[PDB]
Design a binder for this molecule. Structure first.
Ligand SMILES: OC[C@H]1O[C@@H](O[C@H]2[C@H](O)[C@H](O)[C@H](O[C@H]3[C@H](O)[C@H](O)[C@@H](O)O[C@@H]3CO)O[C@@H]2CO)[C@@H](O)[C@@H](O)[C@@H]1O
Length: 294
């Protein structure tokens, strides 16, 4: 399937793949799948990041639901970055363990799909700014996922709710080395801390890619009440760094400035959605499908 060599992610045809896509809050709106996933593909996204629940905080996504969402993605010519969200911001190892068990439990939905699915082990596990503690978690669990027969590229979110990318700079190679398949990439979520201005965006990207580690900005936003989405897009394009905007629809009121679409079908994008789809360095301009799809 997918493979990582230095700071590049390669598709199953060996062609570099640069993620340009959208997060979708599937776990909380499970019945929107057949509308939302194809609508995201219609915007030119080459990758969808699909929010799943392991039952820790929300309604567990069962094996049939996983199969359903994956299939909707690959049959609309998107790679599926699957992620478990129930450990968000938690420092406790038990929350990471729960996500790891979930992947193992659900392995029969994932095995064989390594050319179209990438596994983001847990959304924003380890909220505190502590690179060592963060690393120790992944060093312990990545070999267990490999032992279970999962050969997918794995995606690991930075510490600090994704906003402490120093963790990846300092310890990301140690994490990568713990993977016996050497097929692990990293993600930063850029909001007001990690994406607060142009210098910060570029330095945070540089501090990973200059360790010869592969990188996606697996979530990012825009200025609210800031966040430099223009530099995230432009510098990502310059450096071949992947990105995934947050999110299609359904944020709670406090975060609803983050909805990219007014409707589930994507007929009415928000200003934010239009920026991501139709603006400079956005999906229409820069998103290329994985060559597994043609
Ligand atoms: O509570 C009933 C209502 O829930 C809706 O799903 C919510 C989830 O339970 C979470 O609370 C979810 O939280 C996310 C926020 O919306 C922001 O996206 C974000 O940054 O992160 C958090 C989680 O980390 O929000 C949704 C929506 O409010 C939904 O399932 C609905 O059907 C139901 O009636």
């Amino acid at each position: 399937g997918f493979s990582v060599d230095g700071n590049t992610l390669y598709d199953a045809n060996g062609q570099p793949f640069v993620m340009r896509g959208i997060n979708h809050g599937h776990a909380w709106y499970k019945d929107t799948a057949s509308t939302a996933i194809p609508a995201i593909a219609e915007q030119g996204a080459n990758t969808i990041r699909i929010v799943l629940s392991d039952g820790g905080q929300w309604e567990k996504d069962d094996i049939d639901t996983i199969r359903e969402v994956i299939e909707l993605a690959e049959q609309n010519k998107m790679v599926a970055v699957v992620e478990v969200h129930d450990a968000t911001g938690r420092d406790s190892r038990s929350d990471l363990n729960r996500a790891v068990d979930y992947w193992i439990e659900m392995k029969d939905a994932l095995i064989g799909k390594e050319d179209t699915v990438i596994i983001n082990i847990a959304n924003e596990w380890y909220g505190s700014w502590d690179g060592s503690a963060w690393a120790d978690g992944y060093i312990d669990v990545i070999p267990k996922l490999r032992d279970a027969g999962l050969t997918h590229t794995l995606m690991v979110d930075a510490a600090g709710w994704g906003q402490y990318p120093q963790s990846i700079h300092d310890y990301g190679q140690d994490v990568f080395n713990a993977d016996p398949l050497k097929n692990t990439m990293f993600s930063i979520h850029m909001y007001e801390y990690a994406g607060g201005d142009a210098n910060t965006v570029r330095s945070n990207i540089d501090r990973v890619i200059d360790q010869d580690l592969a990188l996606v900005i697996g979530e990012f936003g825009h200025r609210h009440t800031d966040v430099d989405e223009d530099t995230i897009l432009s510098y990502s394009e310059e450096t071949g760094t992947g990105w995934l905007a947050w999110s299609w629809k359904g944020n709670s009121t406090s975060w609803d400035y983050l909805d990219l679409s007014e409707d589930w079908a994507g007929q009415h994008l928000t200003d934010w959605g239009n920026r991501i789809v139709h603006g400079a360095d956005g999906l229409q301009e820069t998103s290329k499908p994985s060559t597994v799809f043609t």
